Structures are given as C-alpha cells and as structure tokens.
Amino acid sequence: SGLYVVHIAAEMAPVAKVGGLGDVVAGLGKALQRKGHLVEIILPKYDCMQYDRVRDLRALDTVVESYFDGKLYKNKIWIGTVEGLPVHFIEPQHPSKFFWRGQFYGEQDDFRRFSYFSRAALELLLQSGKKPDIIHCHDWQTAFVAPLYWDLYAPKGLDSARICFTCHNFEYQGTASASELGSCGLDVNQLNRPDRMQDHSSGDRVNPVKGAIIFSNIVTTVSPTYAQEVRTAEGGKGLHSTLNFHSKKFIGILNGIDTDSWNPATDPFLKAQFNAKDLQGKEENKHALRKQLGLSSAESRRPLVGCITRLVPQKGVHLIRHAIYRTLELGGQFVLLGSSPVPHIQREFEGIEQQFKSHDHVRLLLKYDEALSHTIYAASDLFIIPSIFEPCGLTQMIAMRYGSIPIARKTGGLNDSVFDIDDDTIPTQFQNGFTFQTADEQGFNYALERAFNHYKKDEEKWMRLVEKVMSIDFSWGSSATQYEELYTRSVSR
Ligand SMILES: C[C@H]1O[C@H](O[C@H]2[C@H](O)[C@@H](O)[C@@H](O[C@H]3[C@H](O)[C@@H](O)[C@@H](O)O[C@@H]3CO)O[C@@H]2CO)[C@H](O)[C@@H](O)[C@@H]1N[C@H]1C=C(CO)[C@@H](O)[C@H](O)[C@H]1O
Ligand SMILES: Nc1ncnc2c1ncn2[C@@H]1O[C@H](COP(=O)(O)OP(=O)(O)O)[C@@H](O)[C@H]1O
Ligand SMILES: OC[C@H]1O[C@H](O[C@H]2[C@H](O)[C@@H](O)[C@@H](O)O[C@@H]2CO)[C@H](O)[C@@H](O)[C@@H]1O
Numbered sequence: 001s002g003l004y005v006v007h008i009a010a011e012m013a014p015v016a017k018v019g020g021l022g023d024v025v026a027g028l029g030k031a032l033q034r035k036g037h038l039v040e041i042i043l044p045k046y047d048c049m050q051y052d053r054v055r056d057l058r059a060l061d062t063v064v065e066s067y068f069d070g071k072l073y074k075n076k077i078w079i080g081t082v083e084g085l086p087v088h089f090i091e092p093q094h095p096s097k098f099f100w101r102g103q104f105y106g107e108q109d110d111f112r113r114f115s116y117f118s119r120a121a122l123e124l125l126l127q128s129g130k131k132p133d134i135i136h137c138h139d140w141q142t143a144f145v146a147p148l149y150w151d152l153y154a155p156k157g158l159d160s161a162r163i164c165f166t167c168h169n170f171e172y173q174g175t176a177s178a179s180e181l182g183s184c185g186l187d188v189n190q191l192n193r194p195d196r197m198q199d200h201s202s203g204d205r206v207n208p209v210k211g212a213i214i215f216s217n218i219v220t221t222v223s224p225t226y227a228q229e230v231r232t233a234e235g236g237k238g239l240h241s242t243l244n245f246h247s248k249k250f251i252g253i254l255n256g257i258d259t260d261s262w263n264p265a266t267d268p269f270l271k272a273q274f275n276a277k278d279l280q281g282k283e284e285n286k287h288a289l290r291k292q293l294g295l296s297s298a299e300s301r302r303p304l305v306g307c308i309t310r311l312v313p314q315k316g317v318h319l320i321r322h323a324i325y326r327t328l329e330l331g332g333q334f335v336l337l338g339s340s341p342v343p344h345i346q347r348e349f350e351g352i353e354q355q356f357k358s359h360d361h362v363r364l365l366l367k368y369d370e371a372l373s374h375t376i377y378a379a380s381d382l383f384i385i386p387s388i389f390e391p392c393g394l395t396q397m398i399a400m401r402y403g404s405i406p407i408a409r410k411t412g413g414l415n416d417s418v419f420d421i422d423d424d425t426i427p428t429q430f431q432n433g434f435t436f437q438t439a440d441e442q443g444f445n446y447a448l449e450r451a452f453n454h455y456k457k458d459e460e461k462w463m464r465l466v467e468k469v470m471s472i473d474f475s476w477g478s479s480a481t482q483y484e485e486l487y488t489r490s491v492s493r
Pocket of ligand 2: 018019020021023308309310337338339367368369370373392393394395396
C-alpha cells in the first residue's frame with residue numbers, strides 16, 4: 001500500500017541548509033513518511049554540514065565506485081537519521097574534493113560538483129539493489145538524475161522508478177558549455193539537440209533544468225501562481241516554451257512548512273512558548289529580544305517589524321532598505337536578520353548597520369543564524385516580504401505560524417498565501433495580512449501605513465487577527481497529498 005520514494009537533493013534542513021529548498025526536502029519527506037511511504041534521502045557529505053540533529057551517523061564498509069571523466073572513483077557512504085528520515089551522505093574520494101570546500105554552493109566548478117553527485121547517487125541505488133517506485137530530484141544540481149536514469153540506469157537493471165523533478169527557482173538553470181555534460185557519462189551529441197538539453201538562447205550550451213523537464217514523468221514547482229508566471233515569456237526565463245509544450249505533466253503546488261519544527265508551543269529555541277489560544281508568551285519573546293539586542297521597551301504598543309531573508313535582488317532589497325527607515329519614521333522598531341552573497345549589497349547594509357549600532361529601535365544582524373530567526377518570528381508583530389519575485393517563500397508562512405502578520409508583494413507564492421485584510425473581494429477566511437502590487441516605495445508605504453494603523457488603533461481587533469492567522473493550517477497535509485496522487489498516478493500509468 002506504500003511507495004518507496006527516494007529524494008536526491010543538495011540540501012536538507014537542518015543538516016545542510018541554505019534556504020527554502022532544504023526546508024522543503026525535509027518537510028515533504030516527513031509528510032510522506034507519515035502517509036506510510038518508505039522515504040529515503042540522498043545528500044552529499046558536506047564538510048560544512050550541521051552535525052547536531054544527526055543520529056547514528058556512521059561510515060559504511062561498502063565503498064561505491066562511481067563514473068566521472070571516463071574513470072571510476074571511490075565514494076565513502078555514510079548513513080544517519082535526520083528527524084526520523086533515513087539519509088545517505090555521499091563522501092567522494094575524487095582528487096578535486098568536491099564537498100570539502102567549506103561551502104554548500106558557489107564554487108567555480110559547481111556544475112562538475114553536482115553532476116558527479118547526481119551520478120554517484122544513482123550508482124549508490126544500483127549497487128545496493130534498491131528498487132524505488134519514485135525518485136524525486138530537486139533543482140539544477142540534481143536535474144542530471146532524469147537523463148542519467150533513462151540513458152544509463154533503466155537499461156542496467158534499475159527500471160522500477162518514475163522520475164519526479166521539482167524546480168524551486170527557474171532562475172537557476174545550471175547552464176554551461178556542452179563539453180561539460182560528458183563528465184557525468186551523458187552522451188553530448190544525443191542530448192545537445194533543441195528537442196533535448198540544448199539551451200534556449202545558445203547552440204553550444206546545455207540546460208540541466210530543461211533536460212529534467214523533458215526526461216521526468218512528473219514536473220512541479222512550488223506555487224500555482226509561480227507556475228503560471230513561468231509559462232509566460234516574461235517570467236519563464238527562456239523556458240516558457242518548453243513548459244507550455246510539456247504542460248500536461250507540469251503543475252504548481254504550494255509548499256507547506258514543517259509545523260512540528262515550526263511550532264511556537266514547543267519551540268526549544270524560544271524563551272517562552274505560546275499558541276493561538278494564549279499569546280502571553282509572544283509578548284514575553286518581544287521583551288526578551290528587545291533586551292538581548294538593546295532595543296527600547298519603554299513604550300508599550302510600538303510595533304516590531306521583522307525581516308529574515310537572504311539579501312539578493314529577488315527579495316526586493318531596495319524595498320527592505322526603505323522599510324527600515326519608514327518603519328522608524330512611523331514610530332516602530334525594526335530587526336533585520338540576513339546576509340548577502342553579493343559584496344556591494346553586503347557593503348550597503350553594513351553601512352546602515354553602523355548608522356544604528358546601539359540605536360533604541362533598529363538593529364541589523366548581518367549573518368545566517370538559526371536560533372535567532374526563531375526568536376525574531378516569535379517577537380515580531382509584523383514581517384515583511386517585499387519580493388521582486390518569489391517562487392513560493394516560506395518565511396511568510398512561518399511568520400503567520402508564530403503570529404507575526406505579513407506584509408508582502410503580490411507575486412508568485414506570496415499571491416497564494418498572503419491576502420490583504422482591507423480587500424473586500426477576498427473572502428474573509430483567507431484574509432491574513434497586508435499586500436501591495438507595485439515594486440516601489442509608494443506601493444510598499446500604503447501597505448505599511450495600513451498595517452501600523454491597524455496595529456495601533458484597535459488592540460483587540462488586532463489580537464483577533466493574530467489568533468486567526470495562528471489557526472491557519474500551514475502543514476504539508478494538503479500539498480503532500482497532491483504529490484502522493486502524482487506519484488501513484490504515474491506508477492499506475
Ligand atoms: C535559497 C535558494 O537556494 C538555491 O539557490 C542557489 C543556487 O541553486 C546555487 O547554484 C547558487 O546560485 C548561484 C548560481 O548558480 C550562479 O550561476 C550565480 O548566478 O550566482 C548564484 C548565487 O551564488 O546559490 C543559490 C542560493 O544563493 C535553490 O536552487 C533555490 O531554489 C532556493 N530558493 C527557492 C526555494 C524555495 C523552496 O521551495 C522557494 O520557497 C523560494 O521562493 C525560492 O527562492
Ligand atoms: N539570515 C538568515 N538566518 C537564519 N535563517 C534564514 C536567514 N535567511 C533565510 N533564512 C531561512 O531560510 C528559509 C528561506 O526560505 P524561502 O522563504 O523559501 O526563501 P529562499 O529559499 O529564497 O531563501 C527560511 O527558513 C528562513 O527562516
Ligand atoms: O531517452 C529519450 C527519451 O527519454 C525519456 O523517455 C522516457 C519516458 O519519459 C518514460 O515514460 C519511459 O517511457 O522511459 C523513457 C526512456 O526512454 C523522455 O520522456 C523522452 O522525451 C526522451 O526523448
């Protein structure tokens with residue numbers, strides 16, 4: 001009655017996490033495991049992995065030889081249990097030291113790093129005689145699995161599985177010169193054709209995500225609205241034509257969040273616990289965070305605006321910058337937790353931070369910090385996501401789970417999860433926050449103004465909004481069932 005489902009990905013929360021992809025792999029993984037499926041995950045063994053939620057971590061005695069550049073290479077296989085999921089971590093013994101770089105992403109040879117991993121992952125499956133019903137791969141890094149499976153593993157004895165591919169951001173396609181596709185074992189001449197993996201915008205380049213759209217039996221992305229956006233020329237980023245052709249098997253499914261990990265009632269990272277029925281502990285976290293950061297608590301009813309994000313153009317960094325000053329102008333406080341891989345963006349925020357070193361109302365925390373994010377979601381009254389585009393976004397869901405009311409731009413997943421309380425056309429049950437259309441200060445200001453007005457003018461009306469938003473189901477229940485139905489329908493076919 002239950003499927004055997006393997007997920008191959010570059011991330012899994014909390015052990016190897018950069019953003020939402022890692023969150024999703026774990027969250028969907030666990031939801032599927034509750035539904036009775038044998039779920040297993042295959043990751044790289046990064047040197048920079050987070051050890052502390054890994055149980056029973058051990059190196060197996062079986063070495064697994066894997067192909068790359070015409071030679072076979074040794075891989076140490078590790079197993080462990082990460083939040084009840086079985087995980088296989090691949091440690092390559094290739095002289096280039098692919099997962100020994102101090103970093104998850106951003107090396108000059110990422111293409112080689114993750115195409116190797118993709119090959120070795122399938123090799124691990126073959127060599128253990130595993131016969132999965134579903135192999136689910138994620139983003140460009142493991143897009144290589146789809147053509148690899150069909151070209152080299154279905155005709156070697158591994159022909160049990162259907163392939164599912166999720167793209168969590170179609171911006172990242174993994175494009176490179178065609179020469180580089182041959183490293184993992186794929187036939188360049190066969191696959192560098194317009195009906196296969198040749199890029200949309202060049203002749204001697206290949207496109208991993210395009211290959212995964214073509215070769216997979218199921219293709220998803222992470223919200224219904226984003227799925228529509230990427231079918232248009234302007235949002236598709238070259239791939240719109242391919243997605244329109246293969247539309248029958250392409251569907252957008254709104255991510256959930258892991259509501260066991262993200263739960264104010266049992267969150268171990270918090271000072272005080274709380275829930276929809278008792279917000280006592282929310283005010284206590286607001287006070288604790290102020291005290292930890294050196295923000296003023298002299299006034300009651302000063303709204304704390306939080307923002308937790310990677311600082312990259314996608315997230316509307318000019319609007320985030322503006323929001324700091326506007327929040328302050330409007331008589332609120334602001335806490336930013338974020339860092340940028342882009343130095344000019346890091347430098348711009350570093351300047352703002354110094355400006356507010358020990359200010360009573362503004363603190364900027366320019367770093368990745370898990371513990372702190374928990375207390376920021378808990379403490380904050382308002383949470384901003386003014387994204388230029390957003391495939392899904394999880395932070396707005398986590399914020400609402402912790403009672404913080406979102407202010408979001410109407411785009412991609414935010415359009416499917418955030419609904420303005422002042423728009424009459426929206427049914428009352430969905431209304432949970434504040435939105436704006438245009439990506440400029442004027443648009444953002446009107447949403448922020450209304451949110452500050454609502455917070456200040458009627459405390460008990462506001463408290464109902466918090467209660468209501470905290471009672472919304474953000475779990476994977478609903479969306480895990482949609483993935484399950486795609487899996488079963490493909491297996492039967
Ligand atoms: C958070 C984000 O993580 C992943 O994105 C990473 C890329 O996959 C990496 O390759 C790397 O991007 C570099 C490019 O490859 C390189 O060519 C150059 O353009 O520089 C880039 C930046 O160094 O780094 C990216 C992260 O910085 C993942 O693929 C992406 O999907 C993730 N974000 C989405 C995930 C979810 C979860 O479903 C959605 O909710 C969010 O809306 C997405 O934003
Ligand atoms: N600076 C940071 N410190 C701690 N957690 C962060 C930071 N930036 C982002 N996160 C976390 O990463 C995840 C972001 O996922 P998502 O909203 O899908 O955006 P993206 O995938 O583009 O980063 C959330 O769990 C969020 O709390
Ligand atoms: O090999 C070329 C071919 O690969 C994929 O074909 C799969 C197909 O998707 C599965 O349903 C099943 O029939 O196995 C096939 C492997 O040969 C792509 O789907 C197809 O478009 C591509 O050209």
